[PDB]
Design a protein around this ligand. Structure first.
Ligand SMILES: Nc1ncnc2c1ncn2[C@@H]1O[C@H](COP(=O)(O)OP(=O)(O)O)[C@@H](O)[C@H]1O
Ligand SMILES: Nc1ncnc2c1ncn2[C@@H]1O[C@H](COP(=O)(O)OP(=O)(O)O)[C@@H](O)[C@H]1O
Ligand SMILES: Nc1ncnc2c1ncn2[C@@H]1O[C@H](COP(=O)(O)OP(=O)(O)O)[C@@H](O)[C@H]1O
Ligand SMILES: [Mg+2]
Ligand SMILES: [Mg+2]
Ligand SMILES: [Mg+2]
Lengths: 524, 524, 524, 87
């Protein structure tokens, strides 16, 4: 509406303070010695977390100019989380050091626009160095180590995650849920399973819980619900002839079908139970072909060349057995050929490489794992609900970190990789002196993540940093153990992607931010 | 809306004060000499309670940082109540001692994360120690003592509760209601009974108040309302031929069926009364099978290939007698075999262990006890509603305490068990000194519940503790009689579960709380 | 309701200050060394921009009289942006110099109406000089230079845009969208394409992702949607007789027509499917004739003398092949005479030349590019969301700058064109002295854009101005390299249209503003 | 109390370095690494034997300063109450 305007240094100073407030809050949660930050909620209970992205979202400042600086730095932490789900706190630290030094350079009389370019080119060069340093992380011990390091140095977290990734496979789906006990527990689901139970409670086969176990059953898929649509007798009768159980997947099954069905099942004529498809028409219809092909069956195209009666017994899918409860249906193993299993998976590859990425990929891969791999769920122990969210959150960070480490490798932790690369880029130069200073400023900022970790440990950041620089390769300081050695051998590893993303996201916002001459905001 | 941020010691001090305010409110109500807390309600007259959880829920501080501290400690008291329904005041005290000592350790210059690990390791060991100490409470005398101790040393409450648990059984359901008199009274329900009156007021078998007693009745169950679908008479007529009374359970019965029924019943041709099912769709339908199986009858499943007319006299269940009134229907005993009763109970086991837990188990166990055991209701006598709430509240706490004592045994009271276990753990060490101090801090905090009890009695908390520590096993100080002796022999018992839960819940929040470096809250 | 009135100098001073506030905020972003402006909003994330128009739109002042001045100057920046999309910051600067000097003239005892006439006369003469100075930009290198200069001396932007304009042609359409990747990308579309996908997913000719390729298809256009209006069989059969694929464009196609169509396409009867028309009746109907004429087909005018069945195979248009996916339909090349492609284009000239220009031209030219030229889409890379809009914003400025440069030619950059033309007009005299001063003032103001650029550089604007005036023709100062030379040789180019528009738009509003004797506004 | 007194000792060295515009934490760490009279001379920005270089304090002044500092400190540590004239 109405504006308050500041020029040059006055605008940058206020912006810097906003950045410092946001960043200082974020910094205390960086490292094994990192300490928790509590966010005030008026909803039910306060939240205490060591996750940098969560803290950044929450922070808004009373001073409009300072707030604007903080709001812009908020995004780098936000973007880092979006990319790999970890290193958000580290990214914020880099933004803090780049911005502070860059503004200082601007004060010196240098053109910030040139400074951005220096920084941006330095960043591009730094990224290439990170890729060189990055080494594959395919073994279980290394995966555990990244999980352990990511989840505030918890060895158990990394170990459990490593087992999960190993058992489910490369494309498997891993999730984390609240645990009943104080103990961390891993659950693995083998085969094809979904969240819909049986409409006919009455047909219970052996176990209670409403469990339905059909042995060598035929699977029926349809695009229409069945009411008085019981007319499918030659199809069901054919099944009746073989004396085999029938499993039905469709939009819905009505009381008429179930009433007659229950008696047929109860007298032993046919053991048949029906369960509703996954949900939305786009959702269930897409998911039907895979169940059909997996079981060797044929999907009934209601809207096309098929009808309720029209379909021979061979069109039905076959499975060893199924498990049905009120809320869930499990197929033990449908009998289908590998060419069909892979073919269903192969058509999925286009689906995998999708521009949408959010929503489409998450659900779609779940089908993929289920079709040929497996799905794993991790339970987290903790006496209280608040302890539980912190513990679970860190575990998720480790889960994301392992995913990042596998796909793009790992680099030495403790901030050593950024400080080590900075020495390498010492010879980088640009078009003019202002750019050269910008390049140098970016390198200078690289050091900061290392020293924050040490600072949070209540130890002199400068002492540790000087000895670390003096060292070679992966040599660095272990904050937790309070001693010096090879970071990789100690099991402290940062996934390369989070490290890279942190530096690129920090620099990207920082470069433009340092170039701000004029700030525009509302008056009180 | 901007946020207020505090760092380190300033945040921890404010947090501590919030904790102290909440804890001080709770502490005064701890022990035989515990004092009352009055909660102001604009609803009606103010409430007076000695229950710590009730007091904890109410407390919220003007200062946002202090409030945040209190809200976090509020949860330990709240969680304890949810778990066992007692020891909430004791749990809060442990949080008070743990946090005060822990923050002080942080002040010294130690990693809070390490202190928390020390505390957690000590807690895990403490819990295990409690299980060893826990002496089984399988007799009525011990149960009475735990009830009496829970009820702020009210002997009548404890004895009454023991009789209730004894009479109903292990899976029996015990509830407490406000009495219409000044005297405490126990009510026990035998056989199968439900909260539904009779549709036809007109037919009363003999006793007044709508009391219907059918002698050797046949019981009919249905999934249908009856209006102009009276055609079922061949079934009714068959019963008329028999000369036996008919009991009817269905979704509803209307005047056409009721009006014909009334005259047939009025002049003695048939003695038949109809009552509506338990309540909600699958809740009532779920409960129909047990009624019919218990009585040896068959449920007419509309939903299953059966019909209203289709049912023989033999299908109907048989009972010695039933009792009905305007709001209640009771069956003295159905003729059903034990293997079928157990089969119904066995199938209930899945129902027993379920994710829903809250409310589902409460209603589900009601069916369970009703099916083979008994249901007990306790009335509390008080002239005034305010006196009644305090008296009744303590009774419920005692009821929960007995349930906890039966399930997990008991430990010596007066906080002696926690202080006694602490001596055992004096030999517990972690990876480093910071953890060792955390361990030591937890052990130190164990003593506090004992001393708070003594403190409330106007006696030196430290001296009593020193003499109690010098004792063996269950030796301790009895606050009520002001002298030392064997706590178990004096009838002071703490259910193991409440003691265990108190320590675990208190420590879990306390550990996280001491690790707080930054607190964020809204501006004043 | 009530009004505040100010007279003479006080009114002008408040107006001037309002102008100065707006202009000072805008000036900071002018030049290679220009600096960013950050805008705060309650909707999403704060904006960082170097675009003067974006900054101008936001600014509104607390003082009603100052606001009135700022609002009037806001329009010159806005109008310039709307006219050419670039030079908005420079235009604002001219308004600043014109008004400052003009007001000074007002304070000199001069008639403002005459001063305005002098300004207007000087501007008319200046424009003609600009017309003479402009040299056509026809080579790729020069276009790249204008794009690069507009994009704040970013070489990649100029390179990418130069390739695009050359490839799409003069009437082709170039747009910019946010890119998925970090790097900038260019997409070029050949032939005729539209944004509506296929109704039948089942219909995939060969490649996956819903990709359909029909070889030598017959194209059908209709003004109706097919539900149960299935009959068109003799039309369909004729295509079947031919053995060629059929493409259908209409308001809609239903499942009944699609279901039979799917079966028809699978076995081998016909390879045929339909895609929905562009959108609104006038947009789709107006766009139907061109697709039919392009392919040599006839649009079925349900409205006119044509109906469903009434139309043989020859009526249908032809194309070499089409590309169909979920979101788009592409015609590779329709077979039609150029006597008709041009005819569709020729009627378009009235369509191209009209008052609406916004909405109408974008969509209409889009058709034009598709009909005879090419369409290019540019994707913008950036690590972060804030970087992405700044990068993208500048790219649009370059896109518009290149469009302006090709249409009207280019002039030397750095503001040298205006300073050089001012010397030329040094002998222009009006009716009287007051006008002569007004003229002289406009010439004086021309110099300012050059010096503002130098001022942001951290160098003395006056020293550069004196040296540049002393020089000849295109001689000027390069802010980026800090040295003098030939601006054209350097590659610093100003499209004539942005330069001309800036000067005329600034002057038009400025002349009126200096004329003010009294200002009326609401009370504070 | 012991730790408080031992690290309190560091303050004058660090103060010297701080005044000079040098990092006290860095200088002190290296000086600790050395032995005897070895240390950093703020005036010349060099490390070695401070006494040989030309920087030293009498033992009596160093001792007296340290003991007086501790003596006054202990009195403040033990001071429960203060009494003064109104503002
Ligand atoms: N025990 C440790 N010793 C040395 N460095 C560590 C240790 N644990 C973690 N780090 C490092 O410090 C970084 C930040 O820790 P973290 O809180 O997880 O931040 P993110 O939240 O990961 O920025 C890690 O990415 C890693 O390089
Ligand atoms: N007469 C007593 N003598 C010694 N200890 C007692 C006596 N009565 C109760 N206690 C103890 O003090 C604790 C707290 O009493 P209570 O008010 O019931 O708190 P909860 O509400 O149980 O925290 C008991 O759990 C028990 O161990
Ligand atoms: N590197 C440069 N050296 C000299 N002059 C430049 C340079 N870059 C841009 N200019 C000039 O200064 C003007 C303003 O730059 P710009 O920020 O793009 O403003 P607009 O936003 O174009 O007013 C340009 O139109 C051009 O004439
Ligand atoms: Mg991490
Ligand atoms: Mg109690
Ligand atoms: Mg521009």
């Amino acid at each position: 509406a109405a504006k308050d305007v500041k020029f040059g240094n006055d605008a940058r100073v206020k912006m810097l303070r906003g950045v410092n407030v946001l960043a200082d809050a974020v910094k205390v949660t960086l490292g094994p010695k990192g300490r928790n930050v509590v966010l005030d909620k008026s909803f039910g209970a306060p939240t205490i977390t060591k996750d940098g992205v969560s803290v950044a979202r929450e922070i808004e400042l009373e001073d409009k100019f300072e707030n604007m600086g903080a709001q812009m730095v908020k995004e780098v932490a936000s973007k880092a989380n979006d990319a790999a789900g970890d290193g958000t706190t580290t990214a914020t630290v880099l933004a803090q050091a780049i911005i502070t030094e860059g503004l200082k350079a601007v004060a010196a009389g240098m053109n910030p626009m040139d400074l951005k370019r220096g920084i941006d080119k330095a960043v591009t060069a730094a990224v290439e160095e990170l890729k060189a340093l990055s080494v594959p992380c395919s073994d279980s011990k290394a995966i555990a180590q990244v999980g352990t390091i990511s989840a505030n140095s918890d060895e158990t977290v990394g170990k459990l995650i490593a087992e999960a990734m190993d058992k489910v496979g490369k494309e498997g789906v891993i999730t984390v849920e609240d645990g009943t006990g104080l103990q961390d527990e891993l659950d693995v689901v083998e085969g094809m399973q979904f969240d819909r139970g049986y409409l006919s409670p009455y047909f219970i086969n052996k176990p209670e819980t409403g469990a339905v176990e059909l042995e060598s059953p035929f699977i029926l898929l349809a695009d229409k619900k069945i009411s008085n649509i019981r007319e499918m007798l030659p199809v069901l009768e054919a099944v009746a002839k073989a004396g085999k159980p029938l499993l039905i997947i469709a939009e819905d099954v009505e009381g008429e079908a179930l009433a007659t069905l229950v008696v047929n099942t109860m007298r032993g004529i046919v053991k048949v139970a029906a369960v509703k498809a996954p949900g939305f028409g786009d959702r269930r219809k897409a998911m039907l072909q895979d169940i059909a092909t997996l079981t060797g069956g044929t999907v009934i195209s209601e809207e096309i060349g098929m009808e309720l009666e029209k379909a021979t017994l061979e069109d039905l899918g076959q499975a060893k057995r199924v498990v049905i409860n009120k809320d869930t249906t499990t197929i033990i193993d449908g009998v289908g050929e590998e060419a069909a299993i892979q073919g269903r998976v192969a058509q999925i590859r286009q689906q995998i490489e999708e521009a949408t990425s959010d929503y489409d990929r998450e659900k779609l891969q779940e089908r993929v794992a289920k079709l040929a791999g497996g799905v794993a769920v991790i339970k987290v122990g903790a006496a209280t609900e608040v302890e539980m969210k912190e513990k679970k959150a860190r575990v998720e960070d480790a889960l994301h970190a392992t995913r990042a480490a596998v796909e793009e490798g790992v680099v030495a932790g403790g901030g050593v990789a950024l400080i080590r690369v900075a020495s390498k880029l010492a010879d980088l130069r640009g078009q003019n002196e202002d750019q050269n200073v910008g390049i140098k400023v970016a390198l200078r900022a690289m050091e900061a993540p290392l020293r924050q970790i040490v600072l949070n440990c209540g130890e002199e950041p400068s002492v540790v940093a000087n000895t670390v620089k003096g060292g070679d390769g992966n040599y660095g300081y272990n904050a937790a153990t309070e001693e010096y050695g090879n970071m990789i051998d100690m099991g402290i590893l940062d996934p390369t992607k989070v490290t890279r993303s942190a530096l690129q996201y920090a620099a990207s916002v920082a470069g433009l931010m340092i170039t701000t001459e004029c700030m525009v905001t509302d008056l009180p």
